């Protein structure tokens, strides 16, 4: 039960950390008559305008608090009808809300703590080129990962992994048509490598800069390049438990067998061990020791979690009022 | 210490990521027709059209 | 149960722990009354208080 | 997919630039109960009074933001019929909504920036004849486009296409 219960935290953190679509709200969810729907339908709006591919289906995950308010919003309405009455008998708020095709409670979504960063600015103009591979010393071709990009900042102090930042003046683009959007481009900090450099999971790839060849400028998802004096705006202010939504193909779980059944291990008895619900498989092994008369038991499960499309991952942040 | 052998960099060509889904609502509404080509050349690529009388 | 991650776990072997809860019992509750021998001529008032006790 | 989509971009600008009928609401859409309907029904009403030919069928296009406020306006209402609940489980506003043969959400509709032009007055009296052509220069007859007309103002400053 515990090994199957670690998989869930790794998919819940990996999504809340790398989500690059950030929906902030000035006031707590459910403080207004429909605002529970307008906060979910807001994710549909950025998902549709950002041009992303939903063909395999989308999903939305409420934390238990904001799921009660979505259900409590809907009970204030007159209790006639199927949707209000159902909410009343069981907290349930329909399976599909505002286009998503799923909605759920996921008790394990992490809390996104306050960021103490202030007055942080970029230093120097920084282009980012899309590349498939790059040369390395000894002249060897080496693949390059399209997601992450490193940024030099004035001072990195109070900003940590999974902090949501948006630069001042940058905007999203509809990826196919390259039209400008009203939302400021949001970036989640994957990692901090120094008191200066920071790694942000989307590559901005500005539209305006001239250093990009026509092949590269085709991938531009941001309207303008990072300038020198631009101020980094920290999105997460007050502490609130996040809400996460993705397209179903964005996150992936990879696994490999542990070949302890091989003849090479003759001292221990090992058997296949199946974890209860997730559907991964592990192994089970035990071995004795004559000196201490104390036997050892071990259960091993080897896998990994990968967010393939950090731009398709998104995170809601209700009640974010300074 | 462990097995030291030939490394591989493998890339699965088929899988893709399939990032973009387009929608084009207003191209089905607009009418489409081909004016005659021979007369369209010596024209400025302009063709006048009558308006219903009153 | 705790978990931990790695290949070489040697010398990190965990023990066991399991906890307890104890249910306890309380003081008895009573209904206690007396009657004089002259009052027993009719039991109508006696057989009621036995029901008033239950 | 790229060349097919650039075609979509040009019909988005061309219609927003040459559009004559203008319906302007003083308040943000969705701030009042029927205003999302009144904003559409104003359009179906004006071209009815104006005696247009719609026989080929009409159409209306929201941008993604106002299409959300069309549903948000319809979800506030306490009782759920089939229209209010359909909006809820899906963001769909009904396909007709007061007389248009269809209603859609088109993401690429451009923004129209404000103009700073103030204090403009026309210059003298001006009249426009519905001519099919006119004489010019040598006198050869030259077609005149029905649509456009040239107006002389006091000044053109801040005005734009």
Swiss-Prot record, chain A:
The keyword Oxidoreductase appears for this protein: no
Location relative to the cell = Virion
Spans traversing the lipid bilayer: none
Impact reported for residue 269 to A = No effect on phage growth
Query: What's said on domains?
Result: The insertion domain (I domain) plays an important role in the folding of the capsid protein by acting as an intramolecular chaperone.
Q: Where is this region: I domain?
A: 115-237
Tell me what this protein is called. Answer: Major capsid protein
By sequence similarity, the record places it as follows: Belongs to the P22 phage major capsid protein family.
Subunit record text: Interacts (via N-terminus) with the capsid assembly scaffolding protein (via C-terminus); capsid proteins and scaffolding proteins form building blocks that assemble to form the procapsid. Interacts with the portal protein.
Organism, as annotated: Salmonella phage P22
GO CC terms on record?
T=7 icosahedral viral capsid; viral capsid; viral procapsid
The highest taxon in the source lineage is Viruses
Portion held of the full protein: 109 to 430 of 430
From Swiss-Prot, chain B:
Q: What is the effect of changing residue 5 to A?
A: Impaired phage growth; probable capsid protein misfolding
- Which residues does the annotated region (Binding to the capsid assembly scaffolding protein) include? 2-54
Record note on what altering residue 14 to A does: Impaired phage growth; inability of the mutant capsid protein to interact properly with scaffolding protein
Coiled-coil regions, chain positions? none
Site described as Essential for binding to the capsid assembly scaffolding protein, located at 14
- Compartments in which it is found: Virion
Top-rank taxon, per record: Viruses
**Family, per entry:** Belongs to the P22 phage major capsid protein family.
Q: What does this protein do?
A: Self-assembles to form an icosahedral capsid with a T=7 symmetry.
- Assembly and partners? Interacts (via N-terminus) with the capsid assembly scaffolding protein (via C-terminus); capsid proteins and scaffolding proteins form building blocks that assemble to form the procapsid. Interacts with the portal protein.
Record's comment describing the protein's domains: The insertion domain (I domain) plays an important role in the folding of the capsid protein by acting as an intramolecular chaperone.
Q: What is this protein called?
A: Major capsid protein
The species is: Salmonella phage P22 (Bacteriophage P22)
At the highest ranks, the source species' classification is: Viruses, Duplodnaviria, Heunggongvirae, Uroviricota, Caudoviricetes
Q: Which gene encodes it?
A: 5
The residues of the intact protein that this chain contains are: 1 to 54 of 430
From Swiss-Prot, chain C:
Site (Involved in capsid stabilization and maturation): residue numbering on this chain: 7
**Superkingdom of the source species:** Viruses
Compartments, as annotated in UniProt: Virion
Q: Describe, as the record does, how this protein assembles with itself and its partners.
A: Interacts (via N-terminus) with the capsid assembly scaffolding protein (via C-terminus); capsid proteins and scaffolding proteins form building blocks that assemble to form the procapsid. Interacts with the portal protein.
**Domain comment, as recorded:** The insertion domain (I domain) plays an important role in the folding of the capsid protein by acting as an intramolecular chaperone.
What is this protein's function? Answer: Self-assembles to form an icosahedral capsid with a T=7 symmetry.
- What family does this chain come from, according to its entry? Belongs to the P22 phage major capsid protein family.
- Protein name, UniProt field: Major capsid protein
Q: Which residues of the full protein are shown?
A: 55 to 108 of 430
């Amino acid at each position: 039960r515990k090994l199957a219960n670690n998989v869930e935290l790794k998919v819940a953190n990996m999504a809340a950390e790398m989500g690059s679509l950030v929906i902030t709200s000035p006031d707590a969810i459910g403080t207004n008559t429909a605002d529970a729907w307008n906060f979910v339908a807001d994710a549909e709006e950025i998902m549709f305008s950002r041009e992303l591919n939903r063909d395999m289906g989308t999903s939305y995950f409420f934390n238990p608090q904001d799921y009660k308010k979505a259900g409590y919003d809907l009970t204030k309405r007159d209790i006639f009808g199927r949707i209000p009455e159902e909410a009343y008998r069981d907290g349930t708020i329909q399976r599909q809300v505002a286009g998503f095709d799923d909605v759920l409670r996921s008790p394990k979504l992490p809390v996104l703590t306050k960021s103490t960063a202030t007055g942080i600015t970029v230093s120097g103009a920084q282009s980012f080129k899309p590349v498939a591979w790059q040369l390395d010393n000894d002249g060897n071709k080496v693949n390059v990962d399209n997601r992450f990009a490193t940024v030099t900042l004035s001072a990195t102090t109070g900003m940590k992994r999974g902090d949501k930042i948006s630069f001042a003046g940058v905007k999203f683009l509809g990826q196919m048509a390259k039209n400008v959007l009203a939302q400021d481009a949001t970036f989640s900090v994957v990692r901090v490598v120094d008191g200066t450099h920071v790694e942000i999971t989307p590559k901005p790839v500005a539209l305006d800069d001239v250093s990009l060849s026509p092949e590269q400028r085709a991938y531009a998802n941001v309207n303008t390049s990072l300038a020198d004096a631009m101020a980094v705006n920290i999105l997460n202010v007050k502490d609130a438990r996040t809400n996460v939504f993705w397209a179903d193909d964005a996150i992936r779980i990879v696994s490999q067998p542990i070949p302890a059944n091989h003849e090479l291990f003759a001292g221990m008895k090992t058997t296949s061990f199946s974890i209860p619900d997730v559907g991964l498989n592990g192994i089970f092994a035990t071995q004795g020791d004559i000196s201490t008369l104390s036997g050892l038991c071990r259960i091993a499960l080897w896998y990994g979690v990968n967010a393939t499309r950090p731009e398709a991952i998104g995170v809601g942040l209700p009640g974010q009022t300074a | 210490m462990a097995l030291n052998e030939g490394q591989i960099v493998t890339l699965a060509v088929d899988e893709i990521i399939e990032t973009i889904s387009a929608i084009t609502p207003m191209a089905q509404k607009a009418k489409k027709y081909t004016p005659p080509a021979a007369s369209m050349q010596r024209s400025s690529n302009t063709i006048w059209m009558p308006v219903e009388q009153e | 149960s705790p978990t931990q991650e790695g290949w070489d776990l040697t010398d990190k072997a965990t023990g066991l722990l399991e906890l307890n809860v104890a249910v306890n019992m309380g003081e008895p509750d009573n209904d206690f009354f007396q009657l004089r021998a002259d009052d027993l001529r009719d039991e109508t008032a006696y057989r009621r208080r036995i029901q008033s006790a239950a």
